[model samples]
Target: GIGGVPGPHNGLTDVPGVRVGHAGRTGDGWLTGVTVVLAPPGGAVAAVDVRGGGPGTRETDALDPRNLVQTIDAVVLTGGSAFGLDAAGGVAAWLEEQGRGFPVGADPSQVVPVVPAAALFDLGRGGTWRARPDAALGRAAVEAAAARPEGDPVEQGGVGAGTGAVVGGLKGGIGTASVVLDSGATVAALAAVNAAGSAVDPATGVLYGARTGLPGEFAGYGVPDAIGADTHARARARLAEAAEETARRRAGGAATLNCTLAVVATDATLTRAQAQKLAGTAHDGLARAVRPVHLLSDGDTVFALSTGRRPLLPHLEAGALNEVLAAGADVLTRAVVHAVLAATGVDTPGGVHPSYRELYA
Candidate 1:
């Protein structure tokens, strides 16, 4: 009689065997941080789908079905571009110390933890171009997740990997949601949204997610008033101006395109290849929330993890898996909405990036 009630916390932690934690460095000149999604006690079968042309990822290739490693210890998301990738090393070290990872040798010390990671560009947003995340941040995030029990609600908004995130000329942050099916299977999503495209339509000043909410979800966040012609024109013009600047910076190699990093987790049993398929479909959520997403400048990537704790309804057929994939996409789309809605505005050297609430809530 659950009747598709959302999981407790309605976040990635809702998945039976998944837990999430974040460590943010919002200190002066440091507007970046790290987020970690720890798999089940041992590990979880994982796969990734990278759509952007400019991805800064580590160990994604190892996620392929052809690889020997089928389960992954953890997944890392962070800010700092290439520098953030070093965070994965820290995660691996933590797992290694805990006797987790692929058994490479007979000796305990010979094992190597499989930690795949992706990062978004927030290099200069913290007021200093030189400040970026490091190994310490990764370890901190993993440790935080370890300390928290599964099913606990993770913090969202301008924290962790989303601390300096920006999307569509506005501030962006972390968002998460989950869905439960009658069969007891669950799908959940977590996203650090920093996209090159806009999440709100300029004409109406309304979030793309306004119409997608389930009953009682995003309570009281009403539709925006139709903008007047003058104001509408101004908004469109501002967005166009921002787009120009973004293109200029990207073409000159001054900076890369902003991107979104996310994870979709499910308790349903799935193989590595099936996991990849689920990852691909999760992008549908990205499309629904962000306008002009997956651009060449954006490093949009999504990962799928299956803990195999629940059985697919009506048997493990393709149809059953599709239900989960569809749910994943919807959750991700809603998660993006949460990311923007929960964000708080901040002033940076570049200018002001207002939160969604600030502009239209």
Candidate 2:
């Protein structure tokens, strides 16, 4: 039962010492937001894996195992492509103000907050190209995280970095899931599901990641009987239309891209290299949930953090590490499913993106 059941909260917060906050704007030509995953005081051991070809990120190089920094104060996932990466600056500033960062000199005041961030392409989706996430939004998200109570469920759907998210031709949003291993090591993931791929299988009208859910996690969702040949045809047609629109927009200098940013954390202790491997393995979950992922236009990235609240079994270190990796992949897949199901549709000047529930449910 290493990865058989979900944690109590069934979200990223299930891993103790981890908190999440979201800040964004809606309406009035704005539909972008920021998500901050705040690590515990003194930060947490972390690493990253950026899989997509068009990633817009900041400070990812610092997370490398060979680099100087071994821990991170927070991870920022936001909308607005490269512009969204500015949100990390806000997080870093706030962390520095709180005296929580890597000590650079003899004085506590002399500290540099290590914040890595990734952005999803959601520009002009809110009717305005320049109204994307900024430093203020990042600071607001961190404040919200600090105010949140421990063990509280994470907010999902059309909020935070997912405010302007779109997947295939449908709306995308935030999703999260967690698993408690038999050894009491908890693994959890939070995903901002904005991608240039489909989360639902067109023919079956069911989520590709639904089968990976834990017991009763995806209870109210099932395959719809109304799907058939016509459904498949429509899905294909829509895909072609979306491709045309994307091409047209790019030709017109309005290049709108997509990305799915995720953070996977666990309570178990792990080395920096192990955390990096965990992040890479978690991408398999993304591939499992979304079709035709890691495209040139997609900037999918995943960050893995270890709280070190629990230690791996000394005698069975290898087996324990493998269990954590398996759970990381499974939990990430479940998080993607939750993101899709929780999303709500939006009508923007760019286009009208419908929720999966609107069409399939």
Candidate 3:
């Protein structure tokens, strides 16, 4: 969740050695594509937190330090649902082909690295993506990883997994933004917009739902209720109502929105543990930006990466982990706003639903 690009690659790609490429295709539909994050091959620790009732994870449980890859080198974020998990497989194969991943005992056979993945539901709503994110798309994502060896901002909207994606019954896609600290340090972010809800300014209830053509629009609805009856129903309900009443977006069921996934990158030199702290701080970002985030029915998760280019260790104390995270919360709030603004309501070949952006904008 962000507002504008603090710099190019308003995404984690701004981190040194960090790169991203999208394998997006939509002539046949709405938002549908693959997003790949490639980090230097080795010693990168990672973690994930799911706040949804029905989120998807592929080859996860292997992300903790104990069993995590010696270092995570790449990650795949996409728009398809459970089936989209396969995208990570291709990324793993690519890393293996590049001699990435942890090594097996001296034999080198067991040393393969891990690429944990999370998926949001966008299957039958966009267009019928008979040929959605496949191995070819994976390769394109790889190429994207290669394209930015130096780091730069990439396009936002229907570009990566966000392509053909839906948000609050409206067309949603990919969105990105960044924040630069007074110290000149930069933290970048990208979010796959498919939450079954809206992220309006709760205080004013100023709707921030995606503005596009949505199935809900056709049926006169807004945001799904995938997580109905859950403890967080009230919060998610607020989002659903906003999208429905204000944006006229349509959704599936009790589920508000399936979930949201994001990658945040910073040049700050934080250790894996420290990075975990940074990622934890992202919860604050969710708090201010998104409504009903980390709910019982949402599989909301965020990953923080430290590119290790700015000697972030010394600076960690400058703001303290808490202070740094508070700042990140501010960035996350803006990023979420950016996600909604950049979203375009439309469908993809995969049957993913579109949003008001398509119908209205």
Candidate 4:
């Protein structure tokens, strides 16, 4: 899915010396979980890329890594749906204890810690329609941080931000992938699978239980579900229009609602501006995974961080930064496609909706 670049690692873990950790919540009911993506040692400089109109929260956008001009300390990716925002509460507290945030304190008393986070919609998608990421999960991820694979396939669905996540009527959870550029460089991405389209292939422009792609081939299959809120009918209608725009390959609306949090990391030591460019490059991957993405119906984001292991180098001197940014975007879209390709459809609480494989099959 990551273009022609066979990923050296399955997800963001591909970046030399990077690590990932997650704490999932899969109960008899629904409880979206949380995930924490910790950068390599020495902290990584970071940036954000957002392409949605109705989005909710954007910690990276608000707290640009350029502000401090130092490697970003850490990033919090979660699934409390919206409640997951609370995950940062503990993360902030934890970071304070570690003395890992912006130093606002003077002599020995001032310490200003900054923790950034993003969440997806898993509230009513899984077993209970009530599960969410919490502080315990946050601590669990932190505790397990060191245990996370130095290089391993990212766990998908019912784990980390994927918990209770739903994508277009399909049980969406966490999905990840990575790629290496021709420039002896590599880019990796991790996304909490959450979309607004149906897993069932509507390729014929109609739903007929026709297969599309995987495990979906044999599963008995479940029923169909809605995209929710229909709260502001106008909002819902606006979302549908945005989806159609995506299908048409036109411009998609923006916002934080229907969204996925994507993060990109590398070994390059980049400036905050360069990192922002990196975030922009990864948008290409989002577009690949979702047609006409960044629609108003969804909140699609890309967070970029560099571990500073490699000396910073600009490819095009004048526009090399821009080129790198675009490259990152391209890599990101491929990662999203890989996420869908790796998808293993799941059953909702009431047996509604089919597995991604089944629906595509």
Highest TM-score among the candidates is held by which one? Answer: 2
Per-residue lDDT of candidate 1, residues 1-361 (tens digit): 5636678888899998688989988757778899999997879999999987445799899999899997987999999988889888888889999989988888876778889999998887766777878888899999999999768898999988999898877889999988887678888999999997889876577788656656777864443545456655666665455545544543432345688899999999899999999999999999998898987788999999999887675345877888888888889999999898888887755335666665554
Question: In model 2, which runs have C-alpha deviations exceeding 4 angstroms?
Answer: 1-3, 53-55, 220-256
Q: Tell me the tens digit of each residue's lDDT in model 4 across 1-361.
A: 2333545545778787676777876557655667778765556778887766323453664546536546556677777556777777777666667666666767543555556677776554455544666777776776566577677556655577766565664445566655555554566677776777442233332222222112232123332333223323443344354345433431222213567787887765677877887777676656555544566667777788877766545235545355456556655554454444455644444224333444333
**Tens digits of per-residue lDDT for model 2, 204-321:** 7668898888778876655363666666566566545654664454345333477789999999999999999999999999989999898877888999999988998734898999
TM-score between model 2 and native: 0.92
- Better-scoring candidate (TM-score), 1 or 2: 2
User: How many clashes does the backbone of model 1 have?
Assistant: 0
TM-scores, all models, native as reference: 0.91, 0.92, 0.76, 0.75
- The local lDDT score (0 to 100) that residue 296 gets in candidate 2 is 77
Global lDDT of each model? Answer: 0.83, 0.86, 0.60, 0.59
lDDT of 1: 0.83
> Lowest summed lDDT over 10 consecutive residues: which window, candidate 4?
205-214
Model 4 alpha-carbon drift over 4 Å, by segment: 1-4, 53-55, 104-111, 127-129, 198-201, 204-256, 312-315, 318-323
State in Å the error of residue 131, model 4.
2.5
Quote the lDDT for 99 in model 4: 62
lDDT accuracy of residue 169 in candidate 4: 49
Each candidate structure's count of clashing pairs:
0, 0, 82, 56
